[PDB]
Amino acid sequence: GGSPTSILDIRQGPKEPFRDYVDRFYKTLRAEQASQEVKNWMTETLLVQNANPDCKTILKALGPGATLEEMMTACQGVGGPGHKARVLAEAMSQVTNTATIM
Amino acid sequence: GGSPTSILDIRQGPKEPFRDYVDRFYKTLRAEQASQEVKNWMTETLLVQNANPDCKTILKALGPGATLEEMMTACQGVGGPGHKARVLAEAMSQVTNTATIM
Amino acid sequence: GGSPTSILDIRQGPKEPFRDYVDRFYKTLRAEQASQEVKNWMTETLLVQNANPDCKTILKALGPGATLEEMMTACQGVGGPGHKARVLAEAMSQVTNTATIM
Amino acid sequence: GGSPTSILDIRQGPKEPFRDYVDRFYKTLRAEQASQEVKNWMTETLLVQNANPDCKTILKALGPGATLEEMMTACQGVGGPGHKARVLAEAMSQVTNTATIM
Amino acid sequence: GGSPTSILDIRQGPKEPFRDYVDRFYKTLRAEQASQEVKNWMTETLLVQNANPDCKTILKALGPGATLEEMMTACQGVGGPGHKARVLAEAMSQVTNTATIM
Amino acid sequence: GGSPTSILDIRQGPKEPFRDYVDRFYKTLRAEQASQEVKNWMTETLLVQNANPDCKTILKALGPGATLEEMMTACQGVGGPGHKARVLAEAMSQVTNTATIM
Ligand SMILES: O=P(O)(O)O[C@H]1[C@H](OP(=O)(O)O)[C@@H](OP(=O)(O)O)[C@H](OP(=O)(O)O)[C@@H](OP(=O)(O)O)[C@H]1OP(=O)(O)O
Numbered sequence A, B, C, D, E, F: 001g002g003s004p005t006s007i008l009d010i011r012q013g014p015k016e017p018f019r020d021y022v023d024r025f026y027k028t029l030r031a032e033q034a035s036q037e038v039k040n041w042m043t044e045t046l047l048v049q050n051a052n053p054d055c056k057t058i059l060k061a062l063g064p065g066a067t068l069e070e071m072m073t074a075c076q077g078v079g080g081p082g083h084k085a086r087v088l089a090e091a092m093s094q095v096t097n098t099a100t101i102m
């Protein structure tokens, strides 16, 4: 438990792409002793929870249980400028137009 | 599956210029036994989806899979600073002037 | 006594992942000959005091008593684009909507 | 074909100054068997295209083919905080003050 | 004159946390054959002068004469996402709420 | 004549601090066989021109010929977050408050 790279500490860097950090997770899932159904918790949820807020904030929005292609595409936005561009508009437009809280 | 790069997920860094990546997109291609037509996903849409959203927007800006000179010329706008030069102002007006969502 | 890396100076890179530096502070607490109890108060507090104002502002936000799997989950928000993706919208509203100081 | 250092892949890092890439486009052509005029789409245009858009926005105003003393003194504006000294404010004036689009 | 690491050229990375850099300044101070008082110019004013403007502003804010622990604690804010979360946000209100110039 | 690093091309990285590069300009000046008076024009002007526009906007502000201590102290503001802490507030106010162009 918690052996090197059991998924439990796998991590996506802010500058690490989703499709990249994923290689760091899946590969190490093999390095981890988990049933396929169990790994599904690691890929479905952990992949969202411990990996780069660009994607955590996304896969959570898409929701858990969405296919990995729906997430793979939606998470390709991850990557600073690429994400930050959309996040810039959404956030900038949140505080002011769409999410103006009063 | 898991063989070194089949052009499933080759990747453009979020800051890595499109061109560095085109050589890499192509690099896996020289190793991937992808027929030329098949390579069309590899050139056009791979070069769109996993290629850093800046090209995803730009390739959309020209048209997806535009000539390697067209997607590229336009894609030198990719990269952080590369896009920040333009995309910042445009997005900045996406929120306020051009795309103000009401 | 209070030798280098023990915990006395364990400092976190600002963008460095919560968990990463925590890995420092953990793998390094070994270097710090501490009682099992004398270790923990360093892990909940000393981790918070000298680490990532993003993870310190969060660890504090969750409120102490949050198991690592709970800290890590929240401080996974920490990060350049990682914390900027969540803070961009927030800070932008700290000034305008939520923390508007009059 | 697939040969690097022909300009077809030379590149200025998005953070990288105009000048830092100048050598990348000059020296990389030392390795390329070319004519001086032939090297000119490069010195003039690729030097404008993949050379980190901080310079493409500068060279677009300054103009292309500017002498190495001009593109230098001018695209020395290229640069992470180096351009930010000016460019941030410029984009900030591209949307709101000078180049605002209605 | 120009002797390596006399504190004259010691410096803090623009993102480097205050302390990591302080380890440099101090480590080489041990080497600069100085008196306790002399080392105190390096700790009071050079420390401030080169320590990455994220903190250079802070140390002044607390005011010099504060314990290195004092500046350190107030300088754990130093850092990219680490200093921006607290200070960039402050800049956001420098335009709108607190430093709105007139 | 025009030997490498003769000051004609010495350059400061966009992120490279003024002090660092100044060490690249001074040391390389040793490599440059120049009279002191001549070196002075290189230290006064050339240092200003090809040294990271962060400083260029600063040195120009302090006034050319400011003593290295003056250029340094102010150019310790040079840097990514370090210059940004100031410059972001400034450019932002160049568009809206102080330099609003009508
Ligand atoms: O660290 P921050 O103050 O948040 O800003 C950084 C910094 O930009 P600055 O030049 O303004 O300091 C990086 O510069 P480097 O020191 O890494 O060169 C830049 O890098 P690039 O020019 O290469 O894009 C990076 O972007 P990234 O994290 O994509 O590498 C950008 O961060 P933000 O885009 O998140 O604001």
Ligand SMILES: CC(C)(C)c1ccc([C@@H](Cn2cccc(C(F)(F)F)c2=O)NC2Cc3ccccc3C2)cc1
Residues within 6 Å of the ligand: A080, A081, A084, A085, A088, B080, B081, B082, B083, B084, B085, B086, B088, C084, D014, D054, D078, D079, D080, D081, D082, D083, D084, D087, D088, D091, E084, E088, F088
């Ligand atoms: C949205 C994103 C892509 C991430 C982006 C947007 C804008 C910038 C630069 C301006 N800007 C504009 C053009 C070129 C440069 C360059 F760096 F290339 F020289 C530059 O600094 N301002 C913001 C940077 C930042 C980070 C967090 C808090 C505030 C700011 C202001 C940088 C990055």
